[PDB]
Design a protein around this nucleic acid. Structure first.
Lengths: 49, 61, 150, 76, 63, 87
RNA sequence: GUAGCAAAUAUUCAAAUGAGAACUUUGAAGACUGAAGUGGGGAAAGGUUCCACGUCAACAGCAGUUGGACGUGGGUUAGUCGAUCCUAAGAGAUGGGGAAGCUCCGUUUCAAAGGCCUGAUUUUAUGCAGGCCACCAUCGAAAGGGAAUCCGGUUAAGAUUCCGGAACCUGGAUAUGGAUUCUUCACGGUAACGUAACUGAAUGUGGAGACGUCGGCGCGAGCCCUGGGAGGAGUUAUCUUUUCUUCUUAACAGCUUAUCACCCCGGAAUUGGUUUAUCCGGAGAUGGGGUCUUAUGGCUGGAAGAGGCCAGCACCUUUGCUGGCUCCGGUGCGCUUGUGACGGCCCGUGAAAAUCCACAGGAAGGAAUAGUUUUCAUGCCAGGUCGUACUGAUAACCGCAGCAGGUCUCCAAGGUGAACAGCCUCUAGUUGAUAGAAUAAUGUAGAUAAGGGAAGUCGGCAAAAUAGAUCCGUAACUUCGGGAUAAGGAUUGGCUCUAAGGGUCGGGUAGUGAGGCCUUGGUCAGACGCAGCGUUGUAGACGGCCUUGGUGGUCUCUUGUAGAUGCUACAAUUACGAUCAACUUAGAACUGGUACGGACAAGGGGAAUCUGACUGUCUAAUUAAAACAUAGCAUUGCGAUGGUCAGAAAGU
C-alpha cells in the first residue's frame, strides 16, 4: 500500500525470493521424482493476504 | 493551463493539508503546504485579543 | 445539548487549599454573569441562592431540590419548572413540598434547593415544526426517534 | 541569508568559524544613468550567509584588499 | 475580433442573451456600484465644503 | 409592506397550516426582538442558545425564557420572593 | 468448425525489423478524451506488476517480432514527508466481586494503588532535607491534534531523502560579544505600548491547541484576458505593425505593511458618523493625533551564478567553449482559492487530550576592584527505528477473468453560454476493444413521412409537440405565504450608429526676499585604463554639491526654440475641464429567398375525482405506493428504597 508495515514487507520479500522456477540441475540427480516447481505463484493468478 | 499536485500522500483537502500554489525560480508552478493560521492570545477576563503580543502557534513561543 | 435550560458555570473557592473549585449549576431565571450566588443555611433569600428548605419561609418557589440531604440536586431540574414549599415541621424536621407533577412530597429540612424558576421556560409552547426540528432535538440526547407504530 | 551592514563585516571576516567568502559582480543599470559594477561580498560561516552590497569600484577595490589573507575567496 | 465587435456593441441583441438580467449582471452589484458612487460623491462634497453636516446627512439617507 | 399578516413566517411558505404558522410566529418575533439591557440601559440583548440573553456591548449574559428575556412566571417569582424576603 | 468473437465515432501510407507484420518501432496524415479528462498525483487494496537485457512452447477468446507474459538481473537512500506521540466514539488489564468453569462485570471503583525537583556533600559519592504533589494502567486516527525544508540538478527505473546551494527545529553541551550591577535584578512613552536582552521556586491563574453552516462584502496569491519592448518560430498568389511562443523568482532573514481593537486631547441636539446589508455615540460620537496583531503585500537579501529563450563556434569519439536578452506595464460582478470584518439560522449554539506560553506570586540566590544573566547575538555536537519502486483501474484492487460492474479524494486552460450544462479547440494522453468482403430477410440503435389526428390500445404505452431570454397578460381557489413559467400572446440575426450609467487628477488665473534645462559663480571625491616583472612608468571619460537669471500668451516674423511635464506676498470665487477605463440596457437606421434561443441546449398545458397534507423512508435482484415516517393531537406509567428495559450471576 506504499505505506506497508515491515511485517508485510518481510513476507512480500520471502514471496519474491520463492518466485523462481526449479533450478534445472536438480532434474539430473538420482531417483529425482521432481519435474517442475509446483508451488509457483504469479501476482495475477492467485493472491495471498 | 498548468495544474499542481500534493506532496505528502494525504490526498484529502482537510486542515493541515492546505495548498497555496506558487511559481518557483525554475519557472515551474508548484503547490506548497501552508501551515495553520494562529488565533491571537486573548484577555483572561474579556473576549477581546491581547495587544502587543505575537500570534505564533503554540511551541513557536 | 439535549437539555433546554442554560447551565450557570459558577466559580467558588476551596476553603482548605488554594484553588477555585468551579461548579456547574442549572441557571435559575434572572441569574446573570458576574453576579454573586450565595450557597448555605445563612445565605439570603434571593434568586440564585442555595439554602436548605428548613432555613426558608413557606410559599417560596425553589428549584434543583435534593430528595435526600447531600444528594446534590434531583427535583425541578428541567426548563421552566419549580417546586413550591407548601408546609413545614421542625418537630421531626421534614418540610412538605409540591412538585411540578402536582404531587405532594415530604423532604428533610437539611435538603437544599436554588430559589426562583429554572430558566428557558415556555420552550415547549412553540411547535417544534417540520420533522427535521425533532430530528436535530433528539440527535444530541438519544436514539429514541422516528417511532414505528407496533 | 542576512545583508549586513556595513559595518560588522570587518569582524565577520575574523569570526574564526568562517573559512570561505565570495565576490559576485553584477553589471546593474540605474535608470540608464550608466551600467556600474554592483559587487557582493558574501561570508559563508556557519549558520548563515552574510551579504555586503557595494555600488562603487573604488570601495570594492579598497576592502577586496582589506579581505584577510587568512580566508578563501571565490571570485565568481 | 469578437471581443472588439462586442466592445462596439454588436452580438448583444435579444437573440444572443440566454441568461436573465439578474444572472448576466446582478441587480445587487448594480445597486452597490451606484450607492458606493453616490456615497463617495457626498463624502468628497462635504470634505471639500460644498455642503455642510446637515444637508450631507439628509442627502446621505435619501441616496 | 409586502405580506398582509404572514410576516416572519413567510419563510415557511404554504406548508404546516395557518394555525401552527401563527403559533410559531408569535414566539419567532419575541426571540428575534431586542430588549433593554437592565445594566446598560441600551436596547440590544442578543438572544443566543434558547434561554440565554447576552448584552451586545457590556458583556453581561442573563438567563431568560426560551423566546422572551423575562417570562410572566419569572416576573411573579421575583415579585413574590421580594415580598416574603422582608420577614 | 455451429453459436458466435457487432456497445466506449477510426483508422490510413511508408520505411525499418523479422522466416513471418492489420496489430511491433519510427516518420507522416486523419481522429478522439476536451481539464466533473482517456491529464497529472494519491487513499485503501495489490506485491515487484516498476526498469533493463534475452526471448515467444503456454497466456493476451484474431495475430504477435509486442506485452502487466516468459527467463536473468537492476531498483525504493529522510533530524524536517508519514508512522512513532496525544486523545475521540470506544476497547481494556489492576483492585475487587460473580461464575462448576471456559471466563463475565467494572476502569475509578467499599485498595496501604509513586514521582518531582533543589542543592547535598565530595566518606574512589551517599545521606539529607528545601520540601512539595497526587480519584490512578494500557490500546484506540498513515484524513482529528501535531517541533522543524526549500530551490535547482541528477537515474534505464529513487528522490520535499541523492548531489549542489541555502535554511530551520528539537535534545544536549559550553566559551566569547552584548545587556544589567554603587544597595544590585534595564530603561523609555501622559497613555494604548515600545526596545537586543533586562533574576523568579512552590502553588495558583489565564491563553493558545480549540473548532457549525450558510449569504453577500473587502483584501491577497494563482490562473484567465491584455499593452510596450528584447528573442525565436508559423503564414505570405492577396491581406495581416501579426499568428504562436520565452521574458520566472522557493523556503528562509530583514526593513516595512491593516481591517479590527485600543490610547490621549476634546464635549456632541441645528442629533451627527456610517454599511451592499442600520448599527454606533455623555459608561464620551464626529474630528485631530497616536499604539498594536504581521495574516497579507512591497523592496531587499536568497539570486542569477539558477532556470528559461537565443546567437556564434567547433568537437572522431564523448563532450563542449564563447557571448547576448531575461525588462516595464495595465485591468476585473472573471475562475479557483486563503482570508478578514459582518450578518441569517437553531427546542441543532456546532470534540477532547498531548503540547506550548504568559501572568499572579515572592521561595532562593547575586555586586563592583569583580559577578549577574543561557527567554539575544554568535560559536560547538547529535538526531535512532520502520515505510518510501509502481497501478489506483473499459488490463495492476473486488467481482472465478486482461469482466461495459463496483471502489475514497486533490489540481484544473481558451471560445460560445447564466453556467463545472451540451458542442469545438490548447497542454498532456490515447488512436486500444479480431479483421477482410458484400449490403437479402428479421432484428438492435437512430431518423422522415401526403391526408386524417387516438379511429390503435387494458390504458395516448412509445414517440411527436412545448422549450432560452425580453416585453405584455395571468383565472378559479387559498391556510392570503401561494396557485404562477397558470392560461394566452408579441419580439430575437448581421451591420453602422445614437443615448445613458464611472475612476483619478486640477482646483479655477496678477504682485517680492528665498529653489527642472543652459552655461555661468564657487565647489567636494577622483572611478578607470595603456604597456613590463603586488611592483613600478601610467591613460583619465569626470561621480557628487550649492544659487543667479532666462526661455506658456505674444509686439519682435519670409518663422522660431530648450522647460508649463519650474518651493516664497497682498488673492477676484463656479457647474467645469484634462485624463484613463470596462460592459449593461435602452433607442434608431440599414440589410437578407420573413431568416435569426438558426447547431447544441431546452416546461406541454387545461377542467375534474379518489387518495396521502407537505419535504423525507423501504421490499439490494419482479411491488416506491394510497404503505412507513413526520409535525400536530390524545392517552397511559413513574417523584428515584422509582418507571420502562438488560443480565447465568454479581461490590452488574
Amino acid at each position: 500500500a506504499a505505506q506497508k508495515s515491515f511485517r508485510i514487507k518481510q513476507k512480500m520479500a520471502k514471496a519474491k525470493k520463492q518466485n523462481r522456477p526449479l533450478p534445472q540441475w536438480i532434474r539430473l540427480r538420482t531417483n529425482n521424482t521432481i519435474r517442475y516447481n509446483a508451488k509457483r505463484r504469479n501476482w495475477r493468478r492467485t493472491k495471498m493476504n | 493551463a498548468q495544474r499542481v499536485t500534493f506532496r505528502r500522500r494525504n490526498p484529502y483537502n482537510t486542515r493541515s493539508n492546505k495548498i497555496k500554489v506558487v511559481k518557483t525560480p525554475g519557472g515551474i508552478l508548484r503547490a506548497q503546504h501552508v501551515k495553520k493560521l494562529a488565533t491571537r492570545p486573548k484577555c483572561g477576563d474579556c473576549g477581546s485579543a491581547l495587544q502587543g503580543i505575537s500570534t505564533l502557534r503554540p511551541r513557536q513561543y | 445539548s439535549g437539555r433546554g435550560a442554560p447551565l450557570a458555570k459558577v466559580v467558588f473557592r476551596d476553603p482548605y487549599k488554594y484553588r477555585l473549585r468551579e461548579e456547574i449549576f442549572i441557571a435559575n431565571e434572572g441569574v446573570h454573569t458576574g453576579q454573586f450566588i450565595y450557597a448555605g443555611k445563612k445565605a439570603s433569600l434571593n434568586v440564585g441562592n442555595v439554602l436548605p428548605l428548613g432555613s426558608v419561609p413557606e410559599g417560596t418557589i425553589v428549584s434543583n431540590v435534593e430528595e435526600k440531604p447531600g444528594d446534590r440536586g434531583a427535583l425541578a431540574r428541567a426548563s421552566g419548572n419549580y417546586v413550591i414549599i407548601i408546609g413545614h415541621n421542625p418537630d421531626e424536621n421534614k418540610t412538605r413540598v409540591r412538585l411540578p407533577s402536582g404531587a405532594k412530597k415530604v423532604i428533610s429540612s437539611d435538603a437544599r434547593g436554588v430559589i426562583g424558576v429554572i430558566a428557558g421556560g415556555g420552550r415547549v409552547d412553540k411547535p417544534l415544526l417540520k420533522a427535521g426540528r425533532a430530528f436535530h432535538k433528539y440527535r444530541l440526547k438519544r436514539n429514541s426517534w422516528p417511532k414505528t407504530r407496533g | 541569508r542576512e545583508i549586513t551592514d556595513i559595518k560588522q563585516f570587518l569582524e565577520l571576516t575574523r569570526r574564526a568559524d568562517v573559512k570561505t567568502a565570495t565576490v559576485k559582480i553584477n553589471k546593474k543599470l540605474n535608470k540608464a544613468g550608466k551600467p556600474f559594477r554592483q559587487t557582493k561580498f558574501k561570508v559563508r560561516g556557519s549558520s548563515s550567509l552574510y551579504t555586503l552590497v557595494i555600488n562603487d569600484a573604488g570601495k570594492a577595490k579598497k576592502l577586496i584588499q582589506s579581505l584577510p589573507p587568512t580566508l578563501k575567496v571565490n571570485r565568481l | 475580433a469578437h471581443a472588439q465587435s462586442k466592445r462596439e456593441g454588436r452580438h448583444s441583441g435579444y437573440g444572443k442573451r440566454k441568461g436573465t438580467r439578474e444572472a448576466r449582471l446582478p441587480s445587487q452589484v448594480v445597486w452597490i456600484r451606484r450607492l458606493r458612487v453616490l456615497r463617495r460623491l457626498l463624502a468628497k462634497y462635504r470634505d471639500a465644503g460644498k455642503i455642510d453636516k446637515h444637508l450631507y446627512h439628509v442627502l446621505y439617507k435619501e441616496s | 409592506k409586502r405580506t398582509k399578516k404572514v410576516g416572519i413566517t413567510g419563510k415557511y411558505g404554504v406548508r404546516y397550516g395557518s394555525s401552527l404558522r401563527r403559533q410559531v410566529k408569535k414566539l419567532e418575533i419575541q426571540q428575534h426582538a431586542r430588549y433593554d439591557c437592565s445594566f446598560c440601559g441600551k436596547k440590544t440583548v442578543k438572544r443566543g442558545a434558547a434561554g440565554i440573553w447576552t448584552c451586545s456591548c457590556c458583556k453581561k449574559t442573563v438567563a431568560g425564557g426560551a423566546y422572551t428575556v423575562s417570562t410572566a412566571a419569572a416576573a411573579t417569582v421575583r415579585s413574590t420572593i421580594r415580598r416574603l424576603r422582608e420577614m
